[PDB]
Amino acid sequence: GNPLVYLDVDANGKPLGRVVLELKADVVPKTAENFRALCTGEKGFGYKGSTFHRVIPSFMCQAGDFTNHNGTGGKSIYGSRFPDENFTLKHVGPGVLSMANAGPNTNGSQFFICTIKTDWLDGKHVVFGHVIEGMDVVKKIESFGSKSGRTSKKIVITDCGQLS
Ligand SMILES: NCCOCCNC(=O)[C@@H]1CCNC(=O)/C=C/C(=O)N2CCC[C@H](C2)C(=O)N[C@@H](Cc2ccco2)C(=O)NCc2ccccc2CC(=O)N1
């Protein structure tokens, strides 16, 4: 019964394809529900039109700051921040979907998709899903990043929603 959601991504207006994500509501229901609702936009806000603002090759692709588009913003469906739900799931390799944060219990809407095993984040960021389809799209996104995280193209979530 875990939901499937999708992000359609383009770079400087050129479509990259669709990333499909399974959300592990069986393990982190509160975190999964937040992401699902931000994909559908059913609360009146969410990810559509927001960007991957920080992309670091051989690390991760970060997105979801739909208020400030720069890593300082975002908000969850519960409020501006909500706590770390649990650290049961681990950053085991590429395709892991995990919450960005600025310290303990600062989850909002920002998230990242790993391109390697980021196991030093275990117990520090809440893992809540993984890529079902479209790792090749993620690798395309990654190819527009840099060591600093600055991107070389504008990477936009042109559509998102829930598949099941
Ligand atoms: N650069 C070349 C060096 O390469 C080595 C690899 N670098 C690493 O491992 C680095 C090493 C240490 N730097 C950082 O923490 C970068 C901080 C950074 O950018 N700020 C600008 C934006 C506002 C501040 C500060 C912030 O903190 N905003 C949140 C996003 C967020 C806000 C509210 C909820 O969520 C964020 O962005 N958290 C960072 C993040 C996000 C996702 C996954 C992991 C991590 C840890 C990480 O990236 N750690």
Residue numbers in the entry: 2 to 165
Question: Which sentences from the paper describe this structure?
Answer:
Cyclophilin D (CypD) is unique as a mitochondrial cyclophilin and a key regulator of the mitochondrial permeability transition pore (mPTP), a transient channel on the inner mitochondrial membrane that opens under oxidative stress or high mitochondrial matrix calcium levels. A key structural feature shared among all cyclophilin isoforms is a shallow and highly conserved PPIase active site. Adjacent to the active site is the S2 pocket, a distinct exo-site that forms part of a long substrate-binding groove for peptides. In particular, three gatekeeper residues (positions 123, 124, and 145 in CypD) and one far S2 pocket residue (position 118 in CypD) are highly diverse among cyclophilins.
